[PDB]
PDB file of C-alpha atoms in Angstrom:
ATOM      1  CA  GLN A   1     123.093 108.289  83.653  1.00  0.00           C
ATOM      2  CA  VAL A   2     120.460 110.547  81.942  1.00  0.00           C
ATOM      3  CA  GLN A   3     117.612 111.403  84.039  1.00  0.00           C
ATOM      4  CA  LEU A   4     114.546 113.877  84.128  1.00  0.00           C
ATOM      5  CA  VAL A   5     112.844 114.154  87.373  1.00  0.00           C
ATOM      6  CA  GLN A   6     109.382 116.035  87.432  1.00  0.00           C
ATOM      7  CA  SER A   7     107.522 117.625  90.192  1.00  0.00           C
ATOM      8  CA  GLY A   8     104.495 116.099  91.871  1.00  0.00           C
ATOM      9  CA  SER A   9     100.824 115.611  91.218  1.00  0.00           C
ATOM     10  CA  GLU A  10      98.722 118.777  91.160  1.00  0.00           C
ATOM     11  CA  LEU A  11      95.007 119.480  92.003  1.00  0.00           C
ATOM     12  CA  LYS A  12      93.697 122.863  90.714  1.00  0.00           C
ATOM     13  CA  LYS A  13      90.283 124.621  90.405  1.00  0.00           C
ATOM     14  CA  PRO A  14      89.342 126.225  86.916  1.00  0.00           C
ATOM     15  CA  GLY A  15      91.041 129.442  86.407  1.00  0.00           C
ATOM     16  CA  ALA A  16      93.875 128.812  88.556  1.00  0.00           C
ATOM     17  CA  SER A  17      97.618 128.545  87.107  1.00  0.00           C
ATOM     18  CA  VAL A  18     100.021 125.722  87.692  1.00  0.00           C
ATOM     19  CA  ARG A  19     103.905 125.323  87.404  1.00  0.00           C
ATOM     20  CA  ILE A  20     105.438 121.965  86.566  1.00  0.00           C
ATOM     21  CA  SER A  21     109.189 121.534  86.862  1.00  0.00           C
ATOM     22  CA  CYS A  22     111.533 119.138  85.049  1.00  0.00           C
ATOM     23  CA  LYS A  23     115.054 118.789  86.552  1.00  0.00           C
ATOM     24  CA  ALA A  24     117.701 117.246  84.234  1.00  0.00           C
ATOM     25  CA  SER A  25     120.729 115.331  85.342  1.00  0.00           C
ATOM     26  CA  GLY A  26     123.284 113.198  83.573  1.00  0.00           C
ATOM     27  CA  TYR A  27     124.137 115.562  80.727  1.00  0.00           C
ATOM     28  CA  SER A  28     124.571 119.283  80.062  1.00  0.00           C
ATOM     29  CA  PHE A  29     121.098 120.509  80.320  1.00  0.00           C
ATOM     30  CA  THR A  30     122.013 123.483  78.101  1.00  0.00           C
ATOM     31  CA  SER A  31     123.289 121.149  75.388  1.00  0.00           C
ATOM     32  CA  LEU A  32     120.032 119.620  74.170  1.00  0.00           C
ATOM     33  CA  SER A  33     116.378 120.927  73.709  1.00  0.00           C
ATOM     34  CA  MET A  34     113.574 120.307  76.006  1.00  0.00           C
ATOM     35  CA  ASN A  35     110.211 119.292  74.704  1.00  0.00           C
ATOM     36  CA  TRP A  36     106.810 119.094  76.361  1.00  0.00           C
ATOM     37  CA  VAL A  37     104.137 116.268  75.738  1.00  0.00           C
ATOM     38  CA  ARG A  38     100.669 116.034  77.139  1.00  0.00           C
ATOM     39  CA  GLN A  39      98.567 112.902  77.414  1.00  0.00           C
ATOM     40  CA  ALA A  40      95.025 113.281  78.685  1.00  0.00           C
ATOM     41  CA  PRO A  41      93.600 110.190  80.508  1.00  0.00           C
ATOM     42  CA  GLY A  42      93.172 107.223  78.105  1.00  0.00           C
ATOM     43  CA  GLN A  43      94.336 109.347  75.106  1.00  0.00           C
ATOM     44  CA  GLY A  44      97.557 109.512  73.066  1.00  0.00           C
ATOM     45  CA  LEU A  45     100.651 111.514  73.183  1.00  0.00           C
ATOM     46  CA  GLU A  46     100.447 115.066  72.002  1.00  0.00           C
ATOM     47  CA  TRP A  47     103.538 117.278  71.370  1.00  0.00           C
ATOM     48  CA  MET A  48     103.134 120.624  73.163  1.00  0.00           C
ATOM     49  CA  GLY A  49     106.370 122.287  71.727  1.00  0.00           C
ATOM     50  CA  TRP A  50     109.920 122.724  72.701  1.00  0.00           C
ATOM     51  CA  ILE A  51     112.275 125.290  74.465  1.00  0.00           C
ATOM     52  CA  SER A  52     115.738 125.980  73.438  1.00  0.00           C
ATOM     53  CA  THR A  53     118.041 125.538  76.433  1.00  0.00           C
ATOM     54  CA  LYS A  54     120.846 127.419  74.210  1.00  0.00           C
ATOM     55  CA  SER A  55     118.957 130.648  74.219  1.00  0.00           C
ATOM     56  CA  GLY A  56     115.776 130.363  76.263  1.00  0.00           C
ATOM     57  CA  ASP A  57     113.509 130.865  73.133  1.00  0.00           C
ATOM     58  CA  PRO A  58     110.308 128.791  73.449  1.00  0.00           C
ATOM     59  CA  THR A  59     108.516 127.367  70.444  1.00  0.00           C
ATOM     60  CA  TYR A  60     104.743 126.289  70.987  1.00  0.00           C
ATOM     61  CA  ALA A  61     102.672 123.889  69.170  1.00  0.00           C
ATOM     62  CA  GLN A  62      99.647 125.384  67.259  1.00  0.00           C
ATOM     63  CA  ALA A  63      97.146 123.714  69.686  1.00  0.00           C
ATOM     64  CA  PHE A  64      99.119 125.007  72.836  1.00  0.00           C
ATOM     65  CA  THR A  65      99.485 128.606  71.971  1.00  0.00           C
ATOM     66  CA  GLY A  66      98.010 131.168  74.429  1.00  0.00           C
ATOM     67  CA  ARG A  67      97.670 129.653  78.054  1.00  0.00           C
ATOM     68  CA  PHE A  68     101.038 127.596  78.112  1.00  0.00           C
ATOM     69  CA  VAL A  69     104.459 129.053  78.965  1.00  0.00           C
ATOM     70  CA  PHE A  70     107.893 127.356  78.671  1.00  0.00           C
ATOM     71  CA  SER A  71     110.614 128.596  80.796  1.00  0.00           C
ATOM     72  CA  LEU A  72     114.068 127.722  82.233  1.00  0.00           C
ATOM     73  CA  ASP A  73     116.396 128.067  85.216  1.00  0.00           C
ATOM     74  CA  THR A  74     119.558 126.673  83.627  1.00  0.00           C
ATOM     75  CA  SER A  75     121.401 127.265  87.026  1.00  0.00           C
ATOM     76  CA  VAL A  76     119.480 124.362  88.519  1.00  0.00           C
ATOM     77  CA  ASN A  77     119.128 122.493  85.266  1.00  0.00           C
ATOM     78  CA  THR A  78     115.456 122.789  85.391  1.00  0.00           C
ATOM     79  CA  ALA A  79     112.752 123.503  82.602  1.00  0.00           C
ATOM     80  CA  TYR A  80     109.260 124.524  83.643  1.00  0.00           C
ATOM     81  CA  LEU A  81     105.873 124.443  82.059  1.00  0.00           C
ATOM     82  CA  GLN A  82     103.061 126.854  83.436  1.00  0.00           C
ATOM     83  CA  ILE A  83      99.436 126.424  82.343  1.00  0.00           C
ATOM     84  CA  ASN A  84      97.260 129.558  83.043  1.00  0.00           C
ATOM     85  CA  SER A  85      93.422 129.795  83.068  1.00  0.00           C
ATOM     86  CA  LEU A  86      93.130 126.142  83.810  1.00  0.00           C
ATOM     87  CA  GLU A  87      90.015 124.392  82.532  1.00  0.00           C
ATOM     88  CA  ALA A  88      88.547 120.864  82.777  1.00  0.00           C
ATOM     89  CA  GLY A  89      90.179 119.767  79.574  1.00  0.00           C
ATOM     90  CA  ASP A  90      93.654 120.370  80.931  1.00  0.00           C
ATOM     91  CA  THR A  91      93.407 117.371  83.330  1.00  0.00           C
ATOM     92  CA  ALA A  92      96.302 115.183  81.934  1.00  0.00           C
ATOM     93  CA  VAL A  93      99.771 113.839  82.588  1.00  0.00           C
ATOM     94  CA  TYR A  94     102.465 116.297  81.329  1.00  0.00           C
ATOM     95  CA  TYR A  95     105.920 114.844  80.319  1.00  0.00           C
ATOM     96  CA  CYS A  96     109.141 116.693  79.712  1.00  0.00           C
ATOM     97  CA  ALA A  97     111.229 114.889  77.113  1.00  0.00           C
ATOM     98  CA  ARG A  98     114.828 115.568  76.014  1.00  0.00           C
ATOM     99  CA  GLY A  99     115.546 116.064  72.262  1.00  0.00           C
ATOM    100  CA  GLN A 100     118.162 113.378  71.229  1.00  0.00           C
ATOM    101  CA  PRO A 101     121.184 114.838  69.437  1.00  0.00           C
ATOM    102  CA  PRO A 102     121.830 115.884  66.928  1.00  0.00           C
ATOM    103  CA  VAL A 103     118.473 117.410  65.624  1.00  0.00           C
ATOM    104  CA  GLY A 104     116.239 116.503  68.548  1.00  0.00           C
ATOM    105  CA  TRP A 105     113.212 115.027  66.696  1.00  0.00           C
ATOM    106  CA  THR A 106     113.667 111.795  68.702  1.00  0.00           C
ATOM    107  CA  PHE A 107     112.834 111.823  72.454  1.00  0.00           C
ATOM    108  CA  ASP A 108     115.513 109.481  74.030  1.00  0.00           C
ATOM    109  CA  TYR A 109     114.717 110.328  77.677  1.00  0.00           C
ATOM    110  CA  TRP A 110     111.436 111.316  79.193  1.00  0.00           C
ATOM    111  CA  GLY A 111     110.448 112.785  82.674  1.00  0.00           C
ATOM    112  CA  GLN A 112     108.208 110.449  84.754  1.00  0.00           C
ATOM    113  CA  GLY A 113     105.209 112.822  84.219  1.00  0.00           C
ATOM    114  CA  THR A 114     103.239 115.060  86.242  1.00  0.00           C
ATOM    115  CA  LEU A 115      99.461 114.548  86.652  1.00  0.00           C
ATOM    116  CA  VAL A 116      97.320 117.786  86.836  1.00  0.00           C
ATOM    117  CA  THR A 117      93.681 117.234  87.844  1.00  0.00           C
ATOM    118  CA  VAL A 118      91.397 120.385  87.219  1.00  0.00           C
ATOM    119  CA  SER A 119      88.377 119.927  89.458  1.00  0.00           C
TER     120      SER A 119
ATOM    121  CA  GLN B   1      92.190 112.128  64.721  1.00  0.00           C
ATOM    122  CA  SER B   2      95.995 112.131  65.186  1.00  0.00           C
ATOM    123  CA  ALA B   3      98.326 112.996  62.279  1.00  0.00           C
ATOM    124  CA  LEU B   4      99.743 109.331  62.201  1.00  0.00           C
ATOM    125  CA  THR B   5      97.485 106.441  61.923  1.00  0.00           C
ATOM    126  CA  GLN B   6      98.224 103.209  63.881  1.00  0.00           C
ATOM    127  CA  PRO B   7      95.941 100.239  64.538  1.00  0.00           C
ATOM    128  CA  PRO B   8      94.198 100.455  67.833  1.00  0.00           C
ATOM    129  CA  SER B   9      95.336  96.992  69.081  1.00  0.00           C
ATOM    130  CA  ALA B  10      97.604  93.961  68.214  1.00  0.00           C
ATOM    131  CA  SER B  11      98.158  90.574  69.829  1.00  0.00           C
ATOM    132  CA  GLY B  12     100.400  87.690  69.881  1.00  0.00           C
ATOM    133  CA  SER B  13     101.484  84.628  71.922  1.00  0.00           C
ATOM    134  CA  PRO B  14     104.923  84.532  73.504  1.00  0.00           C
ATOM    135  CA  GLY B  15     107.696  83.792  71.080  1.00  0.00           C
ATOM    136  CA  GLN B  16     105.602  85.023  67.957  1.00  0.00           C
ATOM    137  CA  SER B  17     106.256  88.205  65.830  1.00  0.00           C
ATOM    138  CA  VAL B  18     103.856  91.079  65.576  1.00  0.00           C
ATOM    139  CA  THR B  19     103.962  94.159  63.376  1.00  0.00           C
ATOM    140  CA  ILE B  20     102.446  97.483  64.162  1.00  0.00           C
ATOM    141  CA  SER B  21     102.024 100.009  61.358  1.00  0.00           C
ATOM    142  CA  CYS B  22     102.189 103.823  61.230  1.00  0.00           C
ATOM    143  CA  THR B  23     100.822 105.482  58.222  1.00  0.00           C
ATOM    144  CA  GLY B  24     101.500 109.237  57.693  1.00  0.00           C
ATOM    145  CA  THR B  25     102.061 111.445  54.657  1.00  0.00           C
ATOM    146  CA  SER B  26     104.800 112.612  52.384  1.00  0.00           C
ATOM    147  CA  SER B  27     104.997 115.757  54.713  1.00  0.00           C
ATOM    148  CA  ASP B  28     106.118 113.589  57.842  1.00  0.00           C
ATOM    149  CA  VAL B  29     106.710 109.791  57.781  1.00  0.00           C
ATOM    150  CA  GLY B  30     107.399 109.553  54.049  1.00  0.00           C
ATOM    151  CA  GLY B  31     109.444 112.665  53.692  1.00  0.00           C
ATOM    152  CA  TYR B  32     112.084 112.303  56.283  1.00  0.00           C
ATOM    153  CA  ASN B  33     113.643 109.565  58.276  1.00  0.00           C
ATOM    154  CA  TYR B  34     113.014 110.781  61.696  1.00  0.00           C
ATOM    155  CA  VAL B  35     110.393 108.193  62.594  1.00  0.00           C
ATOM    156  CA  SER B  36     110.563 107.079  66.216  1.00  0.00           C
ATOM    157  CA  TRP B  37     108.643 104.207  68.274  1.00  0.00           C
ATOM    158  CA  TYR B  38     108.124 104.589  71.970  1.00  0.00           C
ATOM    159  CA  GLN B  39     106.957 101.859  74.429  1.00  0.00           C
ATOM    160  CA  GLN B  40     104.664 102.844  77.178  1.00  0.00           C
ATOM    161  CA  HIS B  41     103.493 100.663  80.125  1.00  0.00           C
ATOM    162  CA  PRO B  42     100.327 102.504  81.214  1.00  0.00           C
ATOM    163  CA  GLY B  43     101.005 104.819  84.241  1.00  0.00           C
ATOM    164  CA  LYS B  44     104.786 104.983  83.327  1.00  0.00           C
ATOM    165  CA  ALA B  45     106.790 107.201  81.015  1.00  0.00           C
ATOM    166  CA  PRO B  46     107.252 106.344  77.354  1.00  0.00           C
ATOM    167  CA  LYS B  47     110.557 104.609  76.619  1.00  0.00           C
ATOM    168  CA  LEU B  48     112.212 105.133  73.341  1.00  0.00           C
ATOM    169  CA  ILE B  49     112.671 101.732  71.319  1.00  0.00           C
ATOM    170  CA  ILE B  50     113.368 102.666  67.730  1.00  0.00           C
ATOM    171  CA  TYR B  51     114.652 105.979  66.117  1.00  0.00           C
ATOM    172  CA  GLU B  52     115.533 107.105  62.661  1.00  0.00           C
ATOM    173  CA  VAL B  53     113.217 104.435  61.314  1.00  0.00           C
ATOM    174  CA  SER B  54     115.522 101.417  62.096  1.00  0.00           C
ATOM    175  CA  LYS B  55     118.083 102.445  64.806  1.00  0.00           C
ATOM    176  CA  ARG B  56     117.902 100.900  68.212  1.00  0.00           C
ATOM    177  CA  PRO B  57     119.048 102.681  71.479  1.00  0.00           C
ATOM    178  CA  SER B  58     121.566 100.807  73.477  1.00  0.00           C
ATOM    179  CA  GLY B  59     119.909  98.290  75.924  1.00  0.00           C
ATOM    180  CA  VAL B  60     117.141  97.751  73.514  1.00  0.00           C
ATOM    181  CA  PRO B  61     117.097  93.973  72.434  1.00  0.00           C
ATOM    182  CA  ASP B  62     117.518  93.119  68.792  1.00  0.00           C
ATOM    183  CA  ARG B  63     114.023  91.589  69.010  1.00  0.00           C
ATOM    184  CA  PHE B  64     112.645  94.981  68.304  1.00  0.00           C
ATOM    185  CA  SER B  65     113.216  96.239  64.562  1.00  0.00           C
ATOM    186  CA  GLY B  66     111.797  99.067  62.566  1.00  0.00           C
ATOM    187  CA  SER B  67     111.299  99.562  58.696  1.00  0.00           C
ATOM    188  CA  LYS B  68     109.444 101.819  56.375  1.00  0.00           C
ATOM    189  CA  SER B  69     107.841 101.645  52.911  1.00  0.00           C
ATOM    190  CA  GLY B  70     106.451 104.764  51.315  1.00  0.00           C
ATOM    191  CA  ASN B  71     104.319 106.566  53.786  1.00  0.00           C
ATOM    192  CA  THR B  72     104.026 103.744  56.278  1.00  0.00           C
ATOM    193  CA  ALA B  73     106.567 102.811  58.957  1.00  0.00           C
ATOM    194  CA  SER B  74     106.525  99.594  60.837  1.00  0.00           C
ATOM    195  CA  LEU B  75     107.764  98.345  64.210  1.00  0.00           C
ATOM    196  CA  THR B  76     108.167  94.537  64.517  1.00  0.00           C
ATOM    197  CA  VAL B  77     108.563  92.725  67.938  1.00  0.00           C
ATOM    198  CA  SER B  78     109.768  89.307  67.424  1.00  0.00           C
ATOM    199  CA  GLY B  79     110.245  86.573  70.168  1.00  0.00           C
ATOM    200  CA  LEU B  80     107.246  88.119  72.031  1.00  0.00           C
ATOM    201  CA  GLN B  81     107.664  88.359  75.800  1.00  0.00           C
ATOM    202  CA  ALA B  82     104.940  89.113  78.482  1.00  0.00           C
ATOM    203  CA  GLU B  83     106.731  92.321  79.330  1.00  0.00           C
ATOM    204  CA  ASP B  84     106.359  93.611  75.712  1.00  0.00           C
ATOM    205  CA  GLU B  85     102.639  94.132  76.636  1.00  0.00           C
ATOM    206  CA  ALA B  86     102.135  97.764  76.495  1.00  0.00           C
ATOM    207  CA  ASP B  87     101.133 100.845  74.244  1.00  0.00           C
ATOM    208  CA  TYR B  88     103.300 101.575  71.254  1.00  0.00           C
ATOM    209  CA  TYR B  89     103.439 105.087  69.859  1.00  0.00           C
ATOM    210  CA  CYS B  90     105.013 106.216  66.468  1.00  0.00           C
ATOM    211  CA  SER B  91     106.158 109.781  65.975  1.00  0.00           C
ATOM    212  CA  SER B  92     107.659 111.846  63.109  1.00  0.00           C
ATOM    213  CA  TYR B  93     109.154 115.121  62.258  1.00  0.00           C
ATOM    214  CA  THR B  94     107.060 117.218  59.852  1.00  0.00           C
ATOM    215  CA  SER B  95     107.880 119.641  57.200  1.00  0.00           C
ATOM    216  CA  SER B  96     106.387 122.325  59.365  1.00  0.00           C
ATOM    217  CA  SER B  97     109.223 121.766  61.841  1.00  0.00           C
ATOM    218  CA  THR B  98     106.780 119.995  64.300  1.00  0.00           C
ATOM    219  CA  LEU B  99     106.536 116.455  65.866  1.00  0.00           C
ATOM    220  CA  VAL B 100     103.491 114.467  65.499  1.00  0.00           C
ATOM    221  CA  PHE B 101     102.498 111.199  67.330  1.00  0.00           C
ATOM    222  CA  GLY B 102     100.358 108.206  66.263  1.00  0.00           C
ATOM    223  CA  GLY B 103      97.210 107.376  68.146  1.00  0.00           C
ATOM    224  CA  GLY B 104      99.019 104.504  69.823  1.00  0.00           C
ATOM    225  CA  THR B 105      98.512 100.708  69.713  1.00  0.00           C
ATOM    226  CA  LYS B 106      97.701  98.395  72.512  1.00  0.00           C
ATOM    227  CA  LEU B 107      99.912  95.334  72.240  1.00  0.00           C
ATOM    228  CA  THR B 108      98.489  92.166  74.165  1.00  0.00           C
ATOM    229  CA  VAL B 109     100.630  89.072  74.862  1.00  0.00           C
ATOM    230  CA  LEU B 110      98.472  86.084  75.176  1.00  0.00           C
TER     231      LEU B 110
END
């Protein structure tokens, strides 16, 4: 069974950094893309970009260029999202979402989400 | 202000059918068949319900269906049940090799 397990809730001050993890089980982590989606409280889903688990190359959405870093540790089947220079507007739930084969523009499995609260 | 336009809310009584629309442009919804629908109970992860306009993942009942006409996709939920009450989001591939979401529709079951 396919599953994405994310790390716990975070509470940070403005200017700090935060690293969120998304551990994949139930398939070959390196066979499918990993995408990142933000949802500010009460708002809709926003696509942050994706990371190729084939090569490690990250591709950021226009709105998420600069302070956001997608990375991988394939040896523990884990994708990471780090947010730098945290600001109040970053308070949100962040999801990882697997790209459904063959082209990965459908997200068939989603992590449970990680709340980040910036005080 | 999202790229795809959805009605903010929709309502129905149990057993009825409700349709939620998702209007994009020829650059996304109309230009490709990679339109998806996700069901989100608030505070839980989105769940894939429809992909590639009309395909259902295994385990999703046949009450959920999807279609498209021009630049507008549609998700239909027939035989409405109380557990269908949730937020529904559409998404689409774009000609810029990105994915865009709709603003979401709150579906209430009376």
